[PDB]
Amino acid sequence: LAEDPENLRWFVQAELVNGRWAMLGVAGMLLPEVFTSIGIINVPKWYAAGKEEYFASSSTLFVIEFILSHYVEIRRWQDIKNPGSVNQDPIFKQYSLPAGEVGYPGGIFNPLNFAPTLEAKEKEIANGRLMLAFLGFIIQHNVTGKGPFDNLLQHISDPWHNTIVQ
């Protein structure tokens, strides 16, 4: 007998998790542009600490890392079904405990709210999308090239290039 727009919690979240990890995603780039120098795929190995002991390996620099993340990630699941995270800023966003205009079922279109301080994650909405779709762009044009813009000598007009494989 259930009709239309339901979901409640759901993937309103997903967006604000994608964009905030798309924002902090392009923060991966950023660096190699004003003073260009080091970039592309890099296989970075990140930034690297001191010159004492390491040499290419010293074991997996991430698998040991992500066990920690784990039981600090299922904690949003330790949240999304039954709300709980003192700050309370994604599940519905802040302002304390409001947005129950969608927490107890019955959305339909609901835009929402949040931040005792002035406005909202609202013009921190756009900045969510532009970054989720920017990656789109960012890892779209690798497969062919890796640098952005110069001036009017012989770059910003596109001369001759190789196309896709075939």
């Binding site: 002991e53 074991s59 997996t60």
Partner: protein
Amino acid sequence: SAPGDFGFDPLGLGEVPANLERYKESELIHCRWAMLAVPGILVPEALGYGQEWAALPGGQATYLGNPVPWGTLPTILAIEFLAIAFVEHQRSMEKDPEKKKYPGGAFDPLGYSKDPKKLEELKVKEIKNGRLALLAFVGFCVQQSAYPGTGPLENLATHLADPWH
């Protein structure tokens, strides 16, 4: 994740609430036997000098008459599984509240039957140590359960090694 929140009474609770893990108090003390065996290493710089039965050279006392089958293995073995039938025989003749025979009726009023015959009895700390042993026995005990040939000879680098294997 087997104790991923589930269980009711006989197969759920009943079998387990202490019982199976109180019989897994054996697991810990058998592991106490196994870690009353292995700690021949544990403390480095020790003074072992040498018996202890190693690598099969002859046996207990050679025996004035050919060894029973052959080896030091079946001599200590074949007995074990009939002499320690002492304990569990007594463990499978129990019951929780009072003991008489198979009398009249004692299913439930208030007081509620009892609790695992030998329940927690409090000390909800043996279990908090029990599962720890189990996790240890099951867990990184495969630090020495995959390719365990060499002993300890640490040379300096870091840790771990992945796969590879």
